[PDB]
Design an enzyme around this catalytic site. Structure first.
Site, PDB file in Angstrom:
ATOM      1  N   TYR A   1       5.539   1.449   5.018  1.00 40.74           N
ATOM      2  CA  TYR A   1       4.910   1.169   3.741  1.00 40.74           C
ATOM      3  C   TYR A   1       4.606  -0.309   3.518  1.00 40.74           C
ATOM      4  O   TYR A   1       4.278  -0.741   2.415  1.00 40.74           O
ATOM      5  CB  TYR A   1       5.854   1.711   2.677  1.00 40.74           C
TER       6      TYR A   1
ATOM      7  N   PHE B   1      17.399   8.245   1.480  1.00 44.58           N
ATOM      8  CA  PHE B   1      16.462   8.279   0.378  1.00 44.58           C
ATOM      9  C   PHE B   1      15.798   9.646   0.245  1.00 44.58           C
ATOM     10  O   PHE B   1      15.180   9.924  -0.791  1.00 44.58           O
ATOM     11  CB  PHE B   1      15.378   7.153   0.535  1.00 44.58           C
ATOM     12  N   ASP B   2      15.805  10.484   1.287  1.00 42.06           N
ATOM     13  CA  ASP B   2      15.286  11.838   1.194  1.00 42.06           C
ATOM     14  C   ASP B   2      15.634  12.644   2.437  1.00 42.06           C
ATOM     15  O   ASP B   2      15.973  12.092   3.482  1.00 42.06           O
ATOM     16  CB  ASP B   2      13.782  11.878   1.041  1.00 42.06           C
TER      17      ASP B   2
ATOM     18  N   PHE C   1      14.409   7.471  10.544  1.00 41.29           N
ATOM     19  CA  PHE C   1      14.354   8.867  10.235  1.00 41.29           C
ATOM     20  C   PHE C   1      15.025   9.682  11.313  1.00 41.29           C
ATOM     21  O   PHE C   1      14.832   9.417  12.487  1.00 41.29           O
ATOM     22  CB  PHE C   1      12.926   9.306  10.103  1.00 41.29           C
TER      23      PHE C   1
ATOM     24  N   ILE D   1       2.940   8.353   7.292  1.00 44.16           N
ATOM     25  CA  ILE D   1       2.952   7.004   7.827  1.00 44.16           C
ATOM     26  C   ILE D   1       2.721   6.961   9.306  1.00 44.16           C
ATOM     27  O   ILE D   1       3.126   7.868  10.053  1.00 44.16           O
ATOM     28  CB  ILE D   1       4.262   6.233   7.652  1.00 44.16           C
TER      29      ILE D   1
ATOM     30  N   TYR E   1      13.781  16.523   8.443  1.00 40.81           N
ATOM     31  CA  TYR E   1      14.030  15.089   8.545  1.00 40.81           C
ATOM     32  C   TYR E   1      15.059  14.647   7.527  1.00 40.81           C
ATOM     33  O   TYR E   1      15.214  15.339   6.521  1.00 40.81           O
ATOM     34  CB  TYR E   1      12.720  14.263   8.318  1.00 40.81           C
TER      35      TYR E   1
HETATM   36  C1  LIG Z   1       8.100   8.097   0.469  1.00 41.63           C
HETATM   37  C2  LIG Z   1       8.352   9.633   0.426  1.00 41.63           C
HETATM   38  C3  LIG Z   1       9.729  10.074   0.904  1.00 41.63           C
HETATM   39  C4  LIG Z   1      10.763   9.186   0.288  1.00 41.63           C
HETATM   40  C5  LIG Z   1      10.059  11.404   0.294  1.00 41.63           C
HETATM   41  C6  LIG Z   1       9.888  10.071   2.420  1.00 41.63           C
HETATM   42  O1  LIG Z   1      10.990  10.286   2.927  1.00 41.63           O
HETATM   43  C7  LIG Z   1       8.782   9.694   3.395  1.00 41.63           C
HETATM   44  O2  LIG Z   1       8.657   8.490   3.623  1.00 41.63           O
HETATM   45  N1  LIG Z   1       7.999  10.555   4.073  1.00 41.63           N
HETATM   46  C8  LIG Z   1       7.852  11.980   3.759  1.00 41.63           C
HETATM   47  C9  LIG Z   1       8.173  12.711   5.053  1.00 41.63           C
HETATM   48  C10 LIG Z   1       7.173  12.346   6.146  1.00 41.63           C
HETATM   49  C11 LIG Z   1       7.320  10.847   6.344  1.00 41.63           C
HETATM   50  C12 LIG Z   1       7.051  10.052   5.071  1.00 41.63           C
HETATM   51  C13 LIG Z   1       5.558  10.053   4.766  1.00 41.63           C
HETATM   52  O3  LIG Z   1       4.741   9.945   5.673  1.00 41.63           O
HETATM   53  O4  LIG Z   1       5.281  10.173   3.473  1.00 41.63           O
HETATM   54  C14 LIG Z   1       3.924  10.404   2.994  1.00 41.63           C
HETATM   55  C15 LIG Z   1       3.277   9.121   2.494  1.00 41.63           C
HETATM   56  C16 LIG Z   1       1.817   8.965   2.900  1.00 41.63           C
HETATM   57  C17 LIG Z   1       1.274   7.599   3.244  1.00 41.63           C
HETATM   58  C18 LIG Z   1       0.921   7.318   4.480  1.00 41.63           C
HETATM   59  C19 LIG Z   1       0.602   6.082   4.811  1.00 41.63           C
HETATM   60  C20 LIG Z   1       0.631   5.122   3.906  1.00 41.63           C
HETATM   61  C21 LIG Z   1       0.969   5.394   2.660  1.00 41.63           C
HETATM   62  C22 LIG Z   1       1.285   6.634   2.334  1.00 41.63           C
HETATM   63  C23 LIG Z   1       3.969  11.401   1.862  1.00 41.63           C
HETATM   64  C24 LIG Z   1       4.085  12.856   2.256  1.00 41.63           C
HETATM   65  C25 LIG Z   1       3.779  13.644   1.019  1.00 41.63           C
HETATM   66  C26 LIG Z   1       4.749  13.296  -0.101  1.00 41.63           C
HETATM   67  C27 LIG Z   1       4.708  11.830  -0.478  1.00 41.63           C
HETATM   68  C28 LIG Z   1       4.977  11.018   0.786  1.00 41.63           C
END
Ligand SMILES: CCC(C)(C)C(=O)C(=O)N1CCCC[C@H]1C(=O)O[C@H](CCc1ccccc1)C1CCCCC1
Length: 107
Positions: free
Chosen positions: A82, A36-37, A99, A56, A26
């Site tokens: 978020y 951002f990543d 994404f 998420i 991704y």
């Molecule tokens: C914010 C992290 C970041 C910038 C790297 C990113 O790109 C991201 O947004 N990600 C990580 C890749 C999968 C999608 C998302 C995520 O579900 O993160 C989950 C968050 C879990 C969550 C779900 C629902 C509500 C709140 C939080 C994590 C995966 C493990 C690492 C930290 C982020």
């Protein structure tokens, strides 16, 4: 909600089921293009199990519509991502996220 726009088609037959681990590549961006990543920068696919509540809601709902091999752009509204919190230092409150996700494999 989550909008899925295809970049490249998958097989149109093998869709992830709850309990399966999706192996994805991704790039996450804000609406202005700001990256951002990216796991593509790490050259290491990210794995998560569908249904485990560990990513998420927009990923749970969006990646379940994708078939193995498909590359798609997921536009996710804040309440599917978020919300009001954002993610400390990286995602602002009330941010729509974009994404580019490639569903590589299902284990
Ligand atoms: C914010 C992290 C970041 C910038 C790297 C990113 O790109 C991201 O947004 N990600 C990580 C890749 C999968 C999608 C998302 C995520 O579900 O993160 C989950 C968050 C879990 C969550 C779900 C629902 C509500 C709140 C939080 C994590 C995966 C493990 C690492 C930290 C982020």
């Amino acid at each position: 909600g989550v909008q899925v726009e295809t970049i490249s088609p998958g097989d149109g037959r093998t869709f992830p089921k709850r309990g399966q681990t999706c192996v994805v590549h991704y790039t996450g961006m804000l609406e202005d293009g700001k990256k951002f990543d990216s796991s593509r920068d790490r050259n290491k696919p990210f794995k998560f199990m569908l249904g485990k509540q560990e990513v998420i809601r927009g990923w749970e709902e969006g990646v379940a519509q994708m078939s193995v091999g498909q590359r798609a752009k997921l536009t996710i509204s804040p309440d599917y991502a978020y919300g009001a919190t954002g993610h400390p230092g990286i995602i602002p409150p009330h941010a729509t996220l974009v994404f580019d996700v490639e569903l590589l494999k299902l284990e």
